[PDB]
Each structure stands twice: as structure tokens, then as C-alpha cells.
Design a protein around this ligand. Structure first.
Ligand SMILES: OC[C@H]1O[C@H](O[C@H]2[C@H](O)[C@@H](O)[C@H](OCCCCCCC3CCCCC3)O[C@@H]2CO)[C@H](O)[C@@H](O)[C@@H]1O
Length: 265
């Protein structure tokens, strides 16, 4: 495999779109690999990890309970509601909604959660409260995936997203139990977790959230490491590429291979 930076460059060339990537040590925050790390990319569904961080912050403050049942109606549902469409009559708890949003990519669950945290503006305010002055959410599902060229709405940068994920998971801004819950939701991702495990060598940890959007936009935020430990945050975003989903997936996997084969940096 090429060196990781070389592989990222090769991927960007093969995809004919922009790639953004960071590799960061979870414990220390050091940046090991960076490529277009200060450029903007649509978050797509990856925003949901930050969303549930904001929910957990409210729980810690005594302003929310993961047990609280949210009642909703059919008119509230948007595209891709695999869990939430089943619970019109019995509702879902706030915690169940975070599980659906992060582990099943349920868009309506994400919108219900957004309403509990003050909407996109509330989520952006939370980002500023934790020192992320770059990432921004402006719209609800599904419009936040529009990925218009040059539009800063609903974007992050690889560097900001990595730092924010590290803050949420490890910095003691969230309580010990809340940090553990956020991590566990990422561990339990059903959309990409098992697929990734099927191609990871034995002994490698993965936790993740993936997203896809318009104009080829694709991303992953992940925790990865050897010896069954979450050693590094890896954030990869793709935008403005015409490539098939399979090819985007394969290029992201190829960056992963390069990282694994050149891990000691
Ligand atoms: O010497 C290291 C390893 O080399 C190979 O492992 C291969 C593996 O067989 C292949 O399937 C994977 O593809 C890459 C799979 C990456 C999965 C997704 C990565 C995501 C998740 C993390 C965020 C970035 C992207 O590459 C590795 C490294 O060459 C050997 O198969 C394995 O026995 C050996 O332990």
C-alpha cells in the first residue's frame, strides 16, 4: 500500500472530487495525517454524533432524560425512517432516538432529537459552547444533505470534526456515563460497522458513523486501532465526485488499508 498521504492523493485523483481527512490520536489529540483538513465538507449523517452529544449534555445538566418518551405523528416523518416508522403509536425514548439516529441512520429520529436541542441553531450554539467555532448546522433532515458547491451550510472541516469528537468522547465535558453512551452508540452502528469488521484484520477496533449526500458527498467519522483499542479518530469526507457508491466505499477502504499498513507514526 502507499503511505497514507499518498493513498489519499491517489483516491482524490481516482474519484475526481475533493477528499478531506484527519487521523488524530484519541488520547492526546495530536494530528498524524491531514489532507484538506481546514476545508469545508457537508457533514451529512455524521452530524448525528454531535447531535447526540448535545442531547447528553442536556441529560447531564438535569434538563433531559434518555428515558423520556417522545410522541410523534406520521406527518413528522421524512425519508429514511426505518425505526421511527414503527413507533407512531407507542413513541420512542430520547435514548432510543439517538440509537436509531446513530446506529440505523434514521432521519426522522434525528429531526425529533434536533427539536429537543433547539434545532440547528441550538446545535450550532452547543458547538460553540464546546469551542468548535467552525462546524455549523443550518437545516433539518433531509435538506441538510444538499451539498451545494461553496455553500457553507451544514458543513464541518476534518480538523474541526475530529477535535469535536475527541471533546465529546474524552474531555469530561460530558459525564462519565454520557461519554460511555456516546461511544457505545458508535460501536453499535449497524449500517457500516459489521461491513467494516468483515474487512478489518483480527484485533482491530472500529466504531463509526457514516453519511452520504448529493453530488457524491460521502463521509465517515470513526475510532480505529489495534489490540482491540480505540487509538485514533479518523475522519474522511468526499465531495463533488461522480463516482459510484461502491467506488467511494472502496477508496475509503483503501485509505484504511494504508493506515493499517503504516500504523506506527
Ligand atoms: O499486516 C496487517 C494486515 O494486513 C492485511 O490486512 C488487510 C485486510 O485484509 C484488508 O481487508 C484491509 O482493507 C482495508 C479495510 C479498511 C476498512 C474501513 C476503514 C475505514 C474505517 C476507519 C475510518 C477510515 C476508513 O487492509 C488490511 C491492511 O492491508 C492482512 O489481511 C492482515 O492479516 C494483516 O494483519
Amino acid at each position: 500500500s502507499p503511505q497514507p498521504l499518498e493513498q489519499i492523493k491517489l483516491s482524490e485523483s481516482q474519484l475526481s472530487g475533493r477528499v478531506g481527512m484527519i487521523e488524530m490520536d484519541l488520547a492526546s489529540g495530536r494530528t498524524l495525517t491531514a489532507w484538506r483538513a481546514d476545508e469545508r465538507f457537508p457533514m451529512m449523517s455524521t452530524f448525528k454524533v454531535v447531535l447526540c452529544g448535545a442531547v447528553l449534555a442536556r441529560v447531564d445538566a438535569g434538563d433531559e432524560q434518555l428515558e423520556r418518551k417522545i410522541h410523534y405523528r406520521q406527518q413528522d416523518l421524512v425519508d429514511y425512517s426505518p425505526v421511527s416508522e414503527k413507533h407512531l403509536a407507542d413513541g420512542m425514548t430520547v435514548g432510543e432516538l439517538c440509537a436509531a439516529a446513530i446506529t440505523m441512520s434514521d432521519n426522522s429520529a434525528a429531526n425529533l432529537l434536533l427539536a429537543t436541542v433547539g434545532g440547528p441553531a441550538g446545535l450550532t450554539a452547543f458547538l460553540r459552547q464546546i469551542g468548535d467555532n467552525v462546524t455549523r448546522l443550518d437545516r433539518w433532515e433531509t435538506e441538510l444533505n444538499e451539498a451545494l458547491p461553496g455553500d457553507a451550510r451544514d458543513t464541518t472541516t476534518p480538523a474541526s470534526m475530529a477535535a469535536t469528537l475527541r471533546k465529546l468522547l474524552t474531555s469530561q465535558r460530558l459525564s462519565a456515563r454520557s461519554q460511555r453512551q456516546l461511544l457505545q452508540w458508535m460501536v453499535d452502528d449497524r449500517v457500516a460497522g459489521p461491513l467494516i469488521r468483515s474487512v478489518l484484520p483480527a484485533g482491530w477496533f472500529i466504531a463509526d458513523k457514516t453519511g452520504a449526500g448529493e453530488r457524491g458527498a460521502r463521509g465517515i467519522v470513526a475510532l480505529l486501532g489495534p489490540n482491540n483499542k480505540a487509538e485514533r479518530i479518523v475522519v474522511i469526507y468526499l465531495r463533488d465526485t461522480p463516482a459510484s457508491m461502491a467506488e467511494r466505499n472502496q477508496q475509503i477502504a483503501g485509505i484504511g488499508a494504508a493506515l493499517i499498513e503504516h500504523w506506527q507514526r
